[PDB]
Design a protein around this ligand. Structure first.
Ligand SMILES: Nc1ncnc2c1ncn2[C@@H]1O[C@H](COP(=O)(O)OP(=O)(O)O)[C@@H](O)[C@H]1O
Ligand SMILES: [Cl-]
Ligand SMILES: [K+]
Ligand SMILES: [Mg+2]
Length: 357
């Protein structure tokens, strides 16, 4: 129970903490964020009562609520109607939340109701993190090994309702997949290898689905190459070694590393690097919420987004252990988050099968 509740609540807490009503998301100097954090009394002193969640939580809740509404043994046509509907409707709750461009534009284009009304054309600039930031609960719903093909399909299609570009929707796959791994207590050092092994199954799905096959295949290597290079850097390509971090890896060094991971200069703003930064933070932090926050919530990149992902994976594994109550007790939508988590638990914690397209 607690771990699903923590998954949803701490994902949202991370989003709020990284965001700081826009002040910290858009600060590009991680050292300055850390100084302002110290002046506020440090992470344990932060009270989120007045720290709004951003687009990341509003969309993650929208994915979660659609999964709960679709119920047991759902038809994927029904689940995709609900997802499209929630994604479109939730754009009405983005005031002061700094929504991402593909997210807001394409959610408002959707036509749920029409057969395939949730599909959009391939686009060269739909590689943002907006698909990845809202996908983690898919793993909460479909954690069992038997459901892997379902997790792959739903993460991908949920993503390309707004991000029809492998760098975008493969980020959704990573977010959902690593959540499932966390639910099953798979050691985090194994997770990157799991993703690499499953990319060919994601391709099989994209190919057979039959939409913009050539464009998808032509853009496929970016995601896979960036992840391979990252896993090799950490010494974890094959999932059979503890990670190795650089000697000098303080706040400034991490800002620089995150920028190096990035597509166009804003670290964690894409489908490849949002989950990658969250993962790097989980790997280093272990059971330390504070270390997780310092690495995934407070940096010069797209920090609420890396936070939303990291906080979900971490809460799944550790619950609320060692988290200051002020970091979540008065969090926006706390009640909706807890209620959806419990309903996802009831669905997720007993293995069922979907009716495919
Ligand atoms: N082909 C692409 N590959 C990787 N990242 C991309 C691509 N196209 C755009 N981006 C990234 O998406 C980010 C902006 O995404 P955004 O406006 O926030 O859309 P969304 O936020 O809904 O994902 C930019 O920082 C840019 O780096
Ligand atoms: Cl601190
Ligand atoms: K930032
Ligand atoms: Mg955000």
């Amino acid at each position: 129970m607690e771990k699903y509740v923590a998954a949803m609540v701490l994902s949202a807490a991370g989003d709020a903490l990284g965001y700081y009503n826009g002040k910290w998301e858009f600060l590009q100097d991680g050292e300055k964020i850390h100084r302002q954090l110290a002046q506020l009394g440090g992470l344990d002193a932060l009270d989120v009562g007045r720290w709004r969640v951003s687009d990341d939580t509003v969309m993650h809740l929208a994915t979660a609520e659609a999964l709960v509404e679709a119920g047991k043994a759902p038809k994927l046509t029904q689940l995709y109607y609900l997802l499209a509907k929630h994604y479109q409707d939730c754009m009405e709750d983005m005031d002061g939340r700094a929504p991402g461009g593909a997210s807001v534009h394409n959610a408002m284009q959707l036509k749920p109701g029409k057969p395939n009304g949730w599909r959009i054309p391939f686009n060269s600039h739909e590689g943002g993190c907006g698909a990845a930031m809202r996908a983690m609960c898919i793993g909460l719903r479909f954690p069992h090994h038997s459901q892997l093909d379902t997790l792959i399909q739903v993460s991908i299609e949920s993503g390309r309702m707004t991000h029809h570009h492998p760098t975008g929707y493969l980020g959704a796959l990573a977010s959902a997949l690593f959540t499932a791994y966390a639910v099953n207590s798979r050691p985090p050092l194994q997770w990157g290898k799991g993703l690499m092994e499953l990319l060919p199954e994601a391709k099989k799905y994209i190919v057979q689905s039959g939409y913009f096959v050539e464009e998808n295949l032509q853009h496929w290597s970016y995601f896979q190459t960036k992840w391979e290079n990252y896993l090799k850097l950490r010494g974890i390509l094959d999932g059979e070694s503890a990670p190795t971090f650089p000697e000098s890896f303080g706040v400034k060094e991490r800002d620089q590393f995150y920028t190096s991971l990035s597509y166009s200069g804003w670290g964690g703003s894409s489908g490849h690097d949002a989950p990658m930064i969250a993962y790097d933070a989980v790997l280093a932090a272990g059971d330390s919420w504070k270390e997780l926050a310092h690495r995934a919530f407070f940096h010069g990149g797209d920090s609420d987004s890396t936070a939303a992902i990291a906080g979900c994976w971490w809460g799944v594994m550790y619950g609320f252990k060692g988290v200051s109550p002020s970091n979540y007790e008065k969090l926006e939508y706390r009640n909706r988050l807890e209620e959806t988590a419990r309903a996802l638990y009831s669905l997720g914690s007993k293995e069922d099968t979907v009716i495919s397209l």
